[PDB]
Amino acid sequence: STPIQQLLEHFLRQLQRKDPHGFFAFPVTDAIAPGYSMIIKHPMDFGTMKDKIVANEYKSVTEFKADFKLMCDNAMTYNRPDTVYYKLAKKILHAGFKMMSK
């Protein structure tokens, strides 16, 4: 793998450690989350991001950060603010961006 893929795998491992319950591990389905496909146009999750790094589909850290922000944004759009899901989305979005920008 390329030096960029190795960097992105490093960031992904540290970001997924912020979600020990695995809520962002795999794609949401409308069985789990009624109406999700009517609300969310562009789903994202950590498993999809890992497959994209392995396939060498990210040109830059910028494109990788955009998928991580899309994931967190979708969770804050679908889930209400008082839920575990919206609170973790907001927490990890900000912590994960500061981690990747240091």
């Binding site: 809520f23 789990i32 009624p34 109406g35 889930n79 839920t83 575990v84 899901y85």
Partner: peptide, 10 residues
């Protein structure tokens, strides 16, 4: 019905 099937309190 807006919300996940479990409350994610594992």
């Amino acid at each position: 019905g807006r919300g996940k099937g479990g409350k994610g309190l594992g």
